[PDB]
């Protein structure tokens, strides 16, 4: 459950948030596979309720109406085509599994759903599954509102409705089996694992009961006896009732402390300095590396009021974002997930974005195709951060140094830091308001290395900055604080 099941040597997954299956299929072939990405976290592939007030928000996909593979991202055959095509070029698919609940209690009964299935939320009826009222926790929840009132009572956090989301009776074998049937259909198709949505809202043991029913991965792509990769979404920033450690027996857990702390550090807020990252990881009170799924931002908190609030860095703060993602991709702690987003018109009111509901780029509700420009950027409002040279090459960096230990740390007691990964990679950052000018021990074999942040190695040449590592491993680094990207990275495969 903890092994990513990505091909050996591939160390990151990318969240292609709201992307269509036909677009992801092609993206695997034209980019993700060749660029060494481990896999793609796709948006919920199961049918959801259509929300019109507001108009087709991204969050309508977290309100299931059935387990049919039919959404704005595409149909079941397109989903299959995507999983097959991606696995064939070595890129896995990880499904965002929304299994804690069905849709909102107030959704109207009818066929206002992504595949036309009928449902009657008012009376908890989902005939397309099928589920009935007795398949929900209404009779188990003791709160007057029927929702979670105290997030300190483990019972209501798990048994009541997460803000009106109809809460499935996960203790019932019928429910457990219906969910497992869905997950197994996906595993058999070729999916490598799952993001378990709203894990905090399910009992660790009910999740275990569902996971235990799952098939081994498809042997057309995985060795026999391979278990699906599981990463559970649990937000725990410390000092709260429910701890992420309660879920370690099921698989990895999202470490939300990661981006919150890194964002605060890179923004140089509240006295934090990059030099304090020397003991990044468990030293900062984070969960064990082998249980962590890390990321700088996720689809929810990149909107500003999620775990970490305004400290979270996103594509909107590109320069700083690249430094945070670069540090994450270079550091050995956790399994890394990179975000890929779409743009929207923000509307801040006293610091809060009220347009955070806006869904993916669309034409009258139909999601727009991801167009690729000659310079590798994307059109139609897709940001495609995963295609930014600075991120793309750091994803490769992580692959190259995979398995190598944290080494050769250096810092200027302020915001200039550097470190390496065994004898295979080295990275230097300047997040101070003045020039970085130092000769540092890289731990790398002597020679000329192409800096992969400013350029690439092509044949026997570099397109950007070159770093000369002397025979004893030391090299001179000069980074202006006015540099577009104030960091340099070199590795065993960027050496000339």
């Amino acid at each position: 459950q903890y092994a990513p099941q990505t091909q050996s040597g591939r160390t990151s997954i990318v969240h292609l948030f709201e992307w269509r299956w036909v677009d992801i299929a092609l993206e695997c072939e034209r980019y993700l596979g060749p660029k060494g990405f481990g896999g793609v976290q796709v948006s919920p592939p199961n049918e959801n309720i259509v929300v019109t007030n507001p108009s087709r928000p991204w969050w309508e996909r977290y309100q299931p109406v059935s387990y049919k593979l039919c959404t704005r991202s595409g149909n079941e055959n397109e989903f299959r085509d995507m999983v097959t095509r991606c696995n064939n070029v070595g890129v896995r698919i990880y499904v965002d599994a929304v299994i804690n609940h069905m849709c909102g209690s107030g959704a109207a009964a009818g066929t206002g759903t992504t595949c036309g299935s009928y449902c009657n939320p008012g009376s908890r009826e989902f005939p397309a599954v099928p589920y009935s009222a007795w398949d929900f926790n209404d009779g188990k929840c003791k709160t007057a509102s029927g929702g979670i009132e105290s997030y300190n009572d483990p019972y209501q956090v798990r048994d009541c409705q997460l803000v009106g989301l109809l809460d499935l009776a996960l203790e019932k074998d019928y429910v457990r089996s219906m969910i497992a049937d869905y997950l197994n259909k996906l595993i058999d198709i070729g999916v490598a694992g799952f993001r378990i949505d709203a894990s905090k809202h399910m009992w660790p043991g009910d999740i275990k009961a569902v996971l235990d029913k799952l098939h081994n991965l498809n042997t057309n792509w995985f060795p026999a006896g391979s278990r699906p990769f599981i990463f559970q979404e649990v937000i725990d920033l410390g000092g709260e009732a429910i701890k992420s450690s309660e879920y370690f027996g099921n698989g990895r857990v999202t470490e939300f402390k990661y981006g919150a702390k890194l964002g605060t550090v890179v923004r140089k807020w509240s006295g934090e300095k990059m030099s304090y990252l020397k003991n990044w990881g468990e030293g900062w009170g984070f969960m064990p590396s082998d249980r962590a799924l890390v990321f700088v931002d996720n689809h929810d908190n990149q909107r500003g009021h999620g775990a970490g609030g305004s400290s979270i860095l996103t594509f909107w703060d590109a320069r700083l974002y690249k430094i945070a993602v670069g540090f994450m991709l270079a550091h050995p702690y956790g399994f890394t997930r990179v975000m890929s987003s779409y743009r929207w018109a923000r509307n801040f009111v006293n610091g809060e974005d009220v347009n955070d509901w806006i869904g993916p780029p669309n034409n009258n509700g139909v999601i727009k195709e991801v167009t690729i420009n000659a310079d590798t950027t994307c059109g139609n409002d897709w940001v495609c951060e995963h295609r930014w040279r600075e991120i793309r090459n750091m994803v490769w960096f992580r692959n190259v140094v995979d398995g190598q230990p944290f080494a050769n740390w250096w810092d200027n007691g302020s915001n200039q830091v550097a470190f390496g990964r065994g004898n295979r990679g080295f990275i230097v950052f300047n997040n101070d308001d003045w020039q970085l000018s130092s000769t540092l021990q890289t731990g790398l074999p002597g020679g000329t290395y192409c800096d992969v942040i400013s350029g690439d190695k092509v044949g026997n040449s570099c397109t950007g900055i070159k770093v000369y590592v002397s025979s004893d491993g030391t090299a001179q680094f000069s980074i202006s604080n006015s540099a577009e990207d104030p960091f340099i990275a070199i590795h065993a495969e960027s050496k000339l």
């Epitope: 929300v51 007030n53 507001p54 928000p57 969050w59 309100q63 849709c103 909102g104 209690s105 107030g106 959704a107 509102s145 029927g146 929702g147 979670i148 009132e149 105290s150 997030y151 409705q161 997460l162 803000v163 009106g164 989301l165 009021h305 509307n347 009111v349 006293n350 610091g351 809060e352 009220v354 347009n355 955070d356 509901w357």
Partner: nanobody
Framework: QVQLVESGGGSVQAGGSLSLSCAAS?????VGWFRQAPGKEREGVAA????????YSADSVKGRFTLSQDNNKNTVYLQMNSLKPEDTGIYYC????????????????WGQGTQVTVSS
Amino acid sequence: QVQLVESGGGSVQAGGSLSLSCAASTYTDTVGWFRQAPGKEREGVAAIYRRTGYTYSADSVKGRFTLSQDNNKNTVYLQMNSLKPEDTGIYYCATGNSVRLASWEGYFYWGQGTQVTVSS
């Protein structure tokens, strides 16, 4: 960029009813009603999470007050039944984005309020 228009309220006899309305210029996840009674601090009355229709009501008015949202517009309605003198006060609509409705936190914009006075 957000404006709120509060309607309803006014004078009514004890045991009577009133229906308040809060029309927002844009969508927000949480909308709550608060009131400030004569010489007392502001108090949460009811709140609704707009992604689902889920509502939370203060013990002081549950069963008597019902908050709902329009199916098409960015407007919420507070049906106030069985009113009593203790309900007199200025009622304010507020927009927020908290998922912890019982905490009354996360509000970022407040309306001008509407007077509610319960006689007898």
